[PDB]
Design an enzyme around this catalytic site. Structure first.
Site, PDB file in Angstrom:
ATOM      1  NE  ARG A  50      35.788  48.613  22.537  1.00 21.38           N
ATOM      2  CZ  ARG A  50      36.938  48.416  22.835  1.00 21.38           C
ATOM      3  NH1 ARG A  50      37.540  47.476  23.063  1.00 21.38           N
ATOM      4  NH2 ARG A  50      37.877  49.771  23.561  1.00 21.38           N
ATOM      5  CG  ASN A 127      40.539  51.280  21.989  1.00 25.15           C
ATOM      6  OD1 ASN A 127      41.898  51.189  21.394  1.00 25.15           O
ATOM      7  ND2 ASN A 127      39.695  50.656  22.947  1.00 25.15           N
ATOM      8  CD  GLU A 128      43.277  50.790  25.085  1.00 26.17           C
ATOM      9  OE1 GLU A 128      44.764  50.568  23.799  1.00 26.17           O
ATOM     10  OE2 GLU A 128      43.142  49.249  25.372  1.00 26.17           O
ATOM     11  CG  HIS A 196      40.415  49.410  27.982  1.00 24.76           C
ATOM     12  ND1 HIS A 196      41.397  49.917  26.835  1.00 24.76           N
ATOM     13  CD2 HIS A 196      39.032  49.161  27.703  1.00 24.76           C
ATOM     14  CE1 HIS A 196      39.711  49.694  25.790  1.00 24.76           C
ATOM     15  NE2 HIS A 196      38.787  50.075  26.950  1.00 24.76           N
ATOM     16  CE1 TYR A 198      44.328  43.876  28.019  1.00 21.05           C
ATOM     17  CE2 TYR A 198      43.836  46.352  28.306  1.00 21.05           C
ATOM     18  CZ  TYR A 198      43.460  44.620  27.220  1.00 21.05           C
ATOM     19  OH  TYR A 198      43.019  44.824  26.736  1.00 21.05           O
ATOM     20  CD  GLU A 225      40.468  46.496  25.116  1.00 20.99           C
ATOM     21  OE1 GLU A 225      41.526  46.366  25.360  1.00 20.99           O
ATOM     22  OE2 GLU A 225      40.811  47.513  23.985  1.00 20.99           O
ATOM     23  CD1 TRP A 254      42.812  41.820  23.515  1.00 21.08           C
ATOM     24  CD2 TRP A 254      41.139  43.446  23.472  1.00 21.08           C
ATOM     25  NE1 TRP A 254      42.766  42.042  22.134  1.00 21.08           N
ATOM     26  CE2 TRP A 254      41.985  43.088  21.621  1.00 21.08           C
ATOM     27  CE3 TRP A 254      40.305  44.431  22.952  1.00 21.08           C
ATOM     28  CZ2 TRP A 254      41.882  43.256  20.779  1.00 21.08           C
ATOM     29  CZ3 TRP A 254      39.979  44.866  21.458  1.00 21.08           C
ATOM     30  CH2 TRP A 254      41.128  44.615  20.626  1.00 21.08           C
TER      31      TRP A 254
END
Length: 302
Positions: A50, A127-128, A196, A198, A225, A254
């Protein structure tokens, strides 16, 4: 022509072989001198990279010849190239962020370098693309559908990858509950959702719930991610990787190297040296459900 495409909620190569992404993000835009990363990432078994690009809104734009070079490095190293416009990050909250429409303008500028590469390149629109501002998060589905429709009308046939709101973590479950509307907006069906994971995903039950929602509904999904448990928010990487393997879902960690001050613990290698893995690099490449043990190269390279 089409190349990589979606059918029955899964990602396939043109020849009918399913493709399960197993890769990492590489910060190309911020580290243009570290193009040795493509070969290095492949050497550890990844099948996808990516690549962080910029449309110029927040960072310096990656022009056509630069993007052509990136695509050539992916292909020569037998990696599927997932290009992404990073400038959209946190829109509605982050000052100076790009909209998805501005990302699309940039993808259209790159049209000549992207057309014909549908077997090799996945386009991650932005992205995001939303932060947590409510009024803009509420526009995720309509803005994303509109961006997809613009790309399709501009002649793009690549599989498109779309990120969630709430800084990619979808803690409001906006992407979870409206992905059907967005998927419907792509008449070709060649759209994949990307979560993603986290700090919102420190609990295994929350991870499994999210991934199974998509699998059970036939909504294509990747974990585009994710970080590890000694990182901000403490995502449960063991569960993320195990569940991605169980459910046959793509994942992209990531990140290769070069994290700024708050996220140095997310470097997989130290200072872009492919022979010097960190504990995180060791974990994602060589640990349980890791890239080296599970990844298969895309069959297009053979």
């Amino acid at each position: 022509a089409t190349g990589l495409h979606v059918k029955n909620g899964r990602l396939y190569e043109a020849n009918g072989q399913e493709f399960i992404i197993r890769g990492v993000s590489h910060p190309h835009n911020w580290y243009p001198q570290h193009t040795q990363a493509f070969a290095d990432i492949k050497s550890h078994g990844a099948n996808t990279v990516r690549v962080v690009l910029s449309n110029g809104v927040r960072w310096s734009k990656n022009g056509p010849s630069d993007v052509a070079n990136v695509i050539s490095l992916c292909k020569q190293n037998r990696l599927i190239c997932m290009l992404e416009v990073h400038d959209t990050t946190g829109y509605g909250e982050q000052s100076g962020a790009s909209t998805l429409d501005q990302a699309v303008d940039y993808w259209i500028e790159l049209k000549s370098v992207l057309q014909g590469e549908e077997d090799y390149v996945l386009i991650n629109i932005g992205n995001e693309p939303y932060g947590n501002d409510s009024a803009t998060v509420a526009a995720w589905a309509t803005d994303t559908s509109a961006a997809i429709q613009r790309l399709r009308a501009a002649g793009f046939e690549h599989t498109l990858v779309v990120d969630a709101p709430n800084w990619g973590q979808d803690w409001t479950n906006t992407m979870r509950n409206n992905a059907d509307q967005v998927y419907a907006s792509d008449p070709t069906g060649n759209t994949v959702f990307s979560i993603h994971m986290y700090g919102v995903y420190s609990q295994a039950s929350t991870i499994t719930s999210y991934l199974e929602h998509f699998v059970n509904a036939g909504l294509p999904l990747i974990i585009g991610e994710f970080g590890h448990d000694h990182s901000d928010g403490n995502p449960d990487e063991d569960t993320i990787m195990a569940e991605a393997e169980r459910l046959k879902l793509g994942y992209i960690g990531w990140s290769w190297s070069g994290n700024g001050g708050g996220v140095e613990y997310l470097d997989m290698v130290y200072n872009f040296d492919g022979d010097n893995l960190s504990p995180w690099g060791e974990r994602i490449f060589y640990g349980p459900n890791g890239i080296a043990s599970t990844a298969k190269e895309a069959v297009i390279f053979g």
